[PDB]
Amino acid sequence: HMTFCLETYLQQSGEYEIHMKRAGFRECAAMIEKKARRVVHIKPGEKILGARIIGIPPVPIGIDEERSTVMIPYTKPCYGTAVVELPVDPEEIERILEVAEP
After folding, report:
1. How many structural domains comprise the chain?
2. CA 70 – CA 26 distance, rounded (Å)
């Protein structure tokens, strides 16, 4: 379960990533649901572009707590919002640092 296609979402509806490299392993499920409104995905394993860039000018508000907690972004794009929550410790961040862009 994984998808690295970013610009393909643009071809479908709208962009939500930067034309870099997205690593959406577990968030691959979330992205599908994120298109609807805003969805939280438990056990995320993505790394979007290394840095989260929607590409579309959004509202820069957001409450990111921890990786092992939900992040409640108030970014209004032309796609949807991403909420991720890992039930595992932020120890996953070590891989995530590398997985920034595989």
Report:
1. 1
2. 15
